[PDB]
Paper text:
Leucine aminopeptidase (LAP) is found in all kingdoms of life and catalyzes the metal-dependent hydrolysis of the N-terminal amino acid residue of peptide or amino acyl substrates. We report here the X-ray structures of three kinetoplastid acidic LAPs (LAP-As from Trypanosoma brucei, Trypanosoma cruzi, and Leishmania major) which were solved in the metal-free and unliganded forms, as well as in a number of ligand complexes, providing insight into ligand binding, metal ion requirements, and oligomeric state. LAPs of the M17 family of aminopeptidases are bilobal proteins with a highly conserved C-terminal domain harboring the aminopeptidase activity. They form homohexamers of approximately 330 kDa with the active sites facing a central cavity separated from the bulk solvent but accessible through solvent channels.
Residue numbers in the entry:
A (entry chain E), D (entry chain D): 5 to 294, 306 to 521
B (entry chain A): 4 to 294, 306 to 521
C (entry chain F): 4 to 295, 306 to 521
């Protein structure tokens, strides 16, 4: 409401709408041709496996010398090792060039991405810590040709584009500490550079949205951001807002977000490709403003949003909806209480046993909307949410939990996680055992399982499935990504690339 | 050591376990018409099947059928029971009336469940038996499913338990006098012979008995004596590494955990070699600790492997087997293992004891090293079973044991066995590269407890155990966390043995 | 629009505070013999001193002395009281008996304590006053110590509190009718004049009133009105930055904390410039939060302390140039409220990641100290911030000693000296910024508002947080006073703080 | 009791009794003279302040070259920066020498050591993480002349001498991962090298004792260790053991340790210097075997023990006793309970309100013993213990809390902390306010304060003072070092060097 808050929020919106990646992509031969051996700056990174680093091709790289060779002997698996090279030609004027070597492990379980982009990210992040002038371009030579996972890994790495440090609040929270990164693959990448940029951009935008505090990213600013992208890329945007949610029967999302300063919203984005589509897919994302899980609770909405943008920018031949379930879970006079009975959009009634379990209610309305109210009926519904603490206990910090009603779709999403690096793992799909945990005396169901130690991740997924439209007969993929959205440095931008890869193999 | 009255009681308990015979027998409709000539075994009869099965024309031809039973079939609810009286129906007891209880089994079954839904079968029969006046009757249980293994275990599990301390049963070696003899009547002669199904049911019930038993009756000593009793009776080998020998021979894990207790810790290994050439060499390792209300059923894993072993011997399955019971009493005392102890495990690796609550995995570490390094053979497959983590319930729930497995193939096979047997399982994340860092220790090779509890808890405990496998072992390792599936609100379920029996069948 | 009845009540409460006059006066034995000619003020008299002081020949010469009083002196316990009746002793109330209560003060006093032990003095007089008959009486309190400032504050603190809502006092603007007038009688004419000691005692008791008062009476609005009332009455300046102006003018800390409340947050700055050339330029900053374990009851302690210390300075015309900035905000649960994970742009320009909304006090103070050190007509030589800030304070320095986090040995020593002299004792906590700073690492903001590890000098770290928001224009001594526990005891507020400041100002 | 446990314990005892430091000390000129410019190995460390690193003297060091200069520019404050130097002469046969530069801050509060040995330790630790082979000697060039604090700082740093990793349990838990470190000061050190070695040795032994788990360091093995040092250095040792404690009236330590497998012990060591002593000092140390504080609970006993050893080895002119209060706090049939009333050795009775507060009881007997039962009466009593969680809340992780009955002794111990780097800070000394917290209905006192938020560190100190002998009229210094004894790598060996420096300035 105050003039100063509004100026700040508009500026934040614009920063998101206009966000451009700091990463570019090329290959060794094209690099020799365009830069003619002259390093982009006083810092260069070389990243690969023990074996890859020893390949004869490496000796032919423009920064190679006997010190770099020694760096390769001395570096530890999963570690870095830096050397100075005197009088190596570079576009900055630097008497020395720093070359940081990083060794990626080859060890990778059957549930992991063989290229180990998790370590790639860590290695580059460590290398960039030795940067003191930030307005430079750092050449990152990677010896893997797994272009999609490497792109997302590098996009994720280092200092984040969202920052409030050292006066950055006056610059719309755009960090001035980020380095431009030029990724140099060995071979011309199987996915074109402009496309990889789009992927990286989405990873970073997703990261931005999740890193952003709730006083900047609100249900209102998120909506404005979506609208900005809709006008810029020419897709459709529908907004069902505040008291319209109540009037139109969306009792779940309405009751959850009803007491807040900013009104709850169901924001649906529509993309129809030029051709005949390979699949019709609906994305549903949870975005709550309220355990330091709460910091990253936009993860799901941000993920589906950014996955959607990538699909539009790459013109993927998938017909897509993206429904953002946006609500501010506020303590107030008009707020939903324990013991409220809600009439969901699906027509089913929900006894609110516990107000802490709001996410699934909001998602219930979301998935019903996606499966019942759009101009098409999807073949696949993917819901993504930072939903349960149980997720971490079950599948851990690197693997999102999958609750899926069909072996085939589950396998495909697992495959995509392994290819993209945004790994997943299944949780028990057994509705006959989940259902009884929601018995209610007076409503069709409760919102919270009676016993917390009876497949917690699965049960939350089950709840959501009860609100799918009868008109939907396809594959439903529930993605609990409570933990994979973040690490000790903040948001990871997990989700979008998983989706992009999933879409590619339809 | 012990008072004369305690020792008499413990011997009698040992004998009750060693001599335990199942209350269940198995036949089929045609054999039943032949042997009983339409006369019911008693004043109660149970009919159990799916909505469709119950409506099959064969059902009308059953000896207890009448228009009231037909009405029962119309009125019964899915997953429920409905009982009717039939006047003057011939029966070997009594009995002016016969009670016929109809139970409807659902057909709904997810891809991770057993299609026959033996979970409901158990519940239905349990409910029906609640209307029994007199015990020491035989109740005919007519089942319409031909899934004989899962039904056998399901009926074995059901109803009143053979272990009891109620109404003076303590003076009868804790053998319940409230159990009914049950005669299961399949539609067709069973694909697995009756004597074999009895063996399976017996193991389910013995396992149940061992887990139901309180820790003042089932001790590291009485469990060992029970194993020895079975060894003498069925002719298999038994090795016992006991107390201070554990320390001298380098088993620092199990030694330090159980060292302060009244009864000494023990590593009890059983050996079975079949007559022929074996299809596989398998080693079973089971955790058996005496210490929220998970602790009541903390013998679940040791009991499971023990009873699975017994079934293999009784059925003469063509598998070469070891069964190592890791038995220790986790006691508070003067000589006890503390927080911050560093233990030298049998594997040679050192373990920093961050938390004494996480003892189960240490004990198992010694167990799996023993099995993979110290026996007359090297196993192709190691299966460890334990009631290990609360996380298991959160992850896979109350009906599915969590599987941490190092090989897709073995995992798929054990899942298949769970689905066939009814003792269902589900996988947890196998990703050692991410589990390992959770056990970083300043001074030892590893800690015994993960730094962060919310990073795949079931998996990490499994990982810990794998670090103690012998380098000689290059096969499939299956870790089974069955903390919750071993029990329900009625006590022990006897989960585990039948899973193993079915897994062994399809090797 | 509050209801008509609430507004009447609140105006009356404001007036009670603005017009508050102490119940204590001060004289000496010789001036007493001269004015009262041996006639006791009333049917109760108190005699308070050390084991040795009580036995001094001067004592026998006091007008209430008799052999029963002597026997009281023998029988009384250290730290205890012992009362005797004296029949027919002359007194102005026309009472058949006079009650004489003797109290023995210990001489034991550690190097970190006030040697006069005013803590016990307070307790002794409190006990004595429990035997009071009539409520309109003056009770002569004969003290055998000449430590006038600490004794003045000790007596001001003692007994029944001027704030009361018992027995219909709500209809009398919460002015207790159970308080006795107290006449303190020193052995020698006091080194500080009586009219000055009255001003001290008044500030102690006003501070006590402000802290005792519940949050439905003392609000950000009524506290501001009270300050304004004192400004019109004593002729000092008052600046008020209020509500949405706080946001517009960049005070993001105090604005975000108090933003969802019924009553708007306020930064209230008072200005006093003495007639002469000042010995020091000092800025006081005080935290005053209303929440919307039982530390919360007394959470105005810091704002009240600095406010009352300021008033004493104006009334005594101390030669110090003073600002007093009250950081007033209601921490309310609501639709428009600041959340966990918010990033705030402080007035200092530094950004703060709100890890925990419970740690609001330091944020509000951050804006306060920046305002004081950057936005005023002068730049202070010394900044003193006072707050009921951490539970850690009690664990570290205890119930009687406020924790000092100070950037300069000299200023610390002086404030300690003032505590020991005034009786409002302090003790230092670790000053080590190089070790405090890493506890506030934030991924996205300049700092968090809460230390990563609670067991790494908790009182110090909160102090450190506050220092990060000092203006670069400031190069002087900063004294952070964590008084979470010394502001109260089992009877309510203690009025701790003002007298400490007054004594600190005296020795500049 | 088993043969294998006893073999292991004897070997552990021996490892402690015979422990020799891995650190040696010299200076630049003596180094040029002995090594003639040839580095000790393939790794060299240079550590100093921003200003010190830029001094002209630095360019004259044998490893200097333009890459090292560039390292000096690029390094961050509190950080390290490593470069390879090709073909620099070194005694190992190494084609390259790694030179790691570390920048020490000059920022230091009035309560800190100006040389910032805390950062020195961290810098050297980081540098040694790049060591290829162990059993090399690493030259550590320091630009500070604060020899005592640098000595302890380097002693503390890197991989610890106690280890159970990778088969070290079969080598009496002597790590094989440690490097020999040669510290090279600019000027010949004001304290001789052999003396600095004794200091470093004590720091590391103390570290060893505290790192050691309770199944290795027991009341019995610690006693055997003390006895081993007594035979070797020729000082006296008195042991009051088990049921003798009860018979001789030590009811505190007896009742605490009475139920354990190993008997409680009061172990007193006696050292009398050749001359007339400058002071008579009694050390008392708490050593309990029993939430992540419990790991390092020998800290106090280990500290006084090792401080004592340094005094004997340096022949400091101080008459010393060192009383180790050793007890195993066990759950058992014969154990001390809540609500027990104990008759302390001092004659005062203690109501055991809470068994968790055992440390102070044990110390009460210790200080009475020291002040009443020895051949001399001390002028100063110093008790050291890992006593309260409150300590961390009050004075933090780097500063031990001092509860002292005399301004002069307090100031001197603070001065020693600042000089030695083993920093301290005072807690409130106010007995008139501590005493009432211990009111007991039936005993002279309770063992635990009624209110936990009334100067917790101070109150525990007060309790201990009540058991001082009336014969004693000197300075009492209580040192609560619950937190400074450890960091994320284990024990710090905090305490001994503080004492040594304190003794130097008497």
């Amino acid at each position: 409401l105050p003039k100063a808050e509004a100026k700040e929020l508009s500026a934040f919106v614009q920063s998101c709408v206009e966000y451009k990646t700091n990463v570019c992509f090329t290959d060794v031969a094209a690099y020799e041709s365009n830069q003619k051996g002259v390093l982009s700056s006083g810092l260069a990174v070389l990243v690969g496996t023990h074996k890859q680093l020893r390949d004869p091709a490496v000796q032919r790289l423009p920064f190679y010398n006997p010190a770099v060779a020694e760096a390769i002997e001395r570096v530890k698996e999963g570690g870095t090792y830096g050397v100075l090279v005197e009088g190596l030609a570079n576009a900055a004027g630097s008497k020395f060039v720093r070359v940081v070597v990083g060794e990626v492990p080859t060890k990778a379980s059957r549930n992991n991405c063989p290229a180990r982009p998790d370590v790639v990210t860590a290695l580059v992040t460590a290398a960039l810590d030795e940067v003191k002038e930030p307005n430079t371009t750092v050449d990152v030579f990677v010896l893997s040709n797994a272009v999609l996972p490497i792109a997302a890994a590098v996009a994720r790495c280092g200092k984040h584009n969202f920052s409030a440090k050292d006066g950055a609040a006056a610059a719309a929270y755009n960090s001035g500490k980020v380095s431009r990164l030029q990724v140099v693959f060995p071979e011309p990448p199987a996915i074109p550079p402009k496309d990889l940029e789009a992927v990286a951009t989405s990873t970073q935008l997703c990261q931005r949205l999740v890193d952003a505090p709730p006083n900047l990213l609100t249900t209102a600013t998120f909506t404005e951001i979506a609208q900005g992208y809709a006008k810029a890329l020419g897709f459709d945007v529908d907004v069902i807002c505040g008291d319209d949610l109540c009037e139109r029967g969306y009792g779940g999302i309405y009751s959850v977000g009803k007491a807040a300063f900013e009104a709850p919203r169901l924001v649906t984005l529509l993309y129809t490709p030029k051709g005949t589509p390979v699949k019709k897919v609906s994305l549903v994302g949870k975005g709550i403003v309220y355990m330091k899980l709460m910091k990253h609770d936009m993860g799901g909405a941000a993920a589906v949003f950014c996955g959607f943008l990538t699909a539009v920018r790459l013109q993927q031949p998938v017909q897509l909806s993206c429904t953002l379930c946006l609500a501010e879970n506020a303590i107030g006079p008009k707020s939903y209480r324990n013991d409220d009975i809600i009439v969901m959009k699906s027509g089913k009634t929900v006894e609110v046993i516990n107000t802490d379990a709001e996410g699934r209610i909001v998602l219930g309305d979301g998935v019903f909307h996606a499966t019942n109210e759009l101009s098409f009926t999807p073949d696949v519904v993917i819901d993504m949410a930072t939903l349960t603490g149980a997720q971490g206990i079950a599948t851990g910090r690197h693997h999102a939990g999958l609750y899926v009603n069909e072996e085939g779709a589950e396998a495909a999403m697992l495959r995509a996680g392994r290819e993209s690096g945004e790994t997943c793992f299944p949780v028990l799909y057994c509705p006959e055992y989940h259902e009884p945990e929601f018995k209610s005396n007076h409503a069709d169901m409760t919102n919270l399982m009676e016993r917390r130690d009876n497949a917690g991740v699965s049960c939350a997924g089950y709840f959501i499935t009860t609100h799918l439209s009868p008109k939907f007969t396809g594959a439903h993929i529930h993605v609990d990504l409570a933990y994979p959205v973040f690490n000790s440095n903040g948001a990871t931008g997990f989700g979008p690339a998983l989706l992009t890869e999933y879409f590619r193999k339809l």
